Design a protein around this nucleic acid. Sequence first.
DNA 1: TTGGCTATAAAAGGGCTC
DNA 2: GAGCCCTTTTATAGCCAA
Lengths: 183, 63, 135
Amino acid sequence: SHMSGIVPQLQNIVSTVNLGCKLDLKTIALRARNAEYNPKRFAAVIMRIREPRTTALIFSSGKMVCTGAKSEEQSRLAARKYARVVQKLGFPAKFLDFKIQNMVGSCDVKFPIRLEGLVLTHQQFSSYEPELFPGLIYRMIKPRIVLLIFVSGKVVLTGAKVRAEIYEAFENIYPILKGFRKT
Amino acid sequence: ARFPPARIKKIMQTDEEIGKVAAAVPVIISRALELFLESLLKKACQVTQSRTMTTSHLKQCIE
Amino acid sequence: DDLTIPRAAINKMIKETLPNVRVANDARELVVNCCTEFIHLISSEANEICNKSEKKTISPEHVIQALESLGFGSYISEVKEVLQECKTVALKRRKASSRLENLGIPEEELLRQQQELFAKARQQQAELAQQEWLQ
DNA sequence: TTGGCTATAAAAGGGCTC
DNA sequence: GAGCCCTTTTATAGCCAA
């Protein structure tokens, strides 16, 4: 009959892009301004940029991982700036196979929730152990996304490849959540 | 008493030389730390009864 | 870093080990600190035994050898046991995931079950809504 | 308050265990 | 070799810190 009326907001995005050319992290870490490198602890350069505020993990194979964006194109932009950076540093930097790998969303249903029950009616899809973690962990099968539901009515959605999966997951869970409202 | 592996790993890596460490390591070090305190406290207790346990009774065990 | 094992952990150890022994708060601070020293001692020795072992990651073996090497050989008994339970825990956890992904109710019926709960809930809030809307 | 543990998804690879 | 680890990011949030 009605749509929740609540639209989940994007909080994080993980994309990957292949620069297509071997890279020497020692070299990159050497001159790149905000670059970290400890092949000791982690086998990849850790670069960051202020806008879009993000973080990239650059590997030797040229492949890269970009995290922190709040939208698909914001993530693709940041990915490009990281590409031009590796580029200016004297490397044959291309921009191949950019792909969003994960999207995180969050919203507020604006009302407490009886996690205690939800984990009973839907036990085969839930994992609730307040001793371990305060929120209820919900695994939706279609679309395939994971939700973090908190007594306060705040809800996190993750695992999506395209934002529609997040909106589909929330619209499915909203009526369930209203059926477990706390009073 | 068992000790926080996460904390133990963070402590281990306060050393720049220490690289990656196997997940199970911090937990055995915890057991080791446990065996070390029991042996240490029990000796210091002896030193205390040969005089409340103080900072001195302990140091004379890390000499 | 100024990381140290939680005071409470050391106090539970003192209580469990020295039942009925007043321990100065000052001394309690020294034990908390010996803890971090020991971790560094074992780690450093293990890290060397490691470089030599042509390996990259400090393994539970390097830690056992450092213990012996450092003069803590008498711990290797109880430490081997813990290393065991660790392998067992990891093994059980591997097999549990294997079953979760390969021997559970076929996804098809799991999906159906879940959609049933979803459609059903839409139905309820559909009525509970329309009814309240009839006022 | 600050911040780290705990939890989730996901990619990248070099290191490891049955 | 199948598959877990580690590292990074982020919403959310109780427990903990001596």
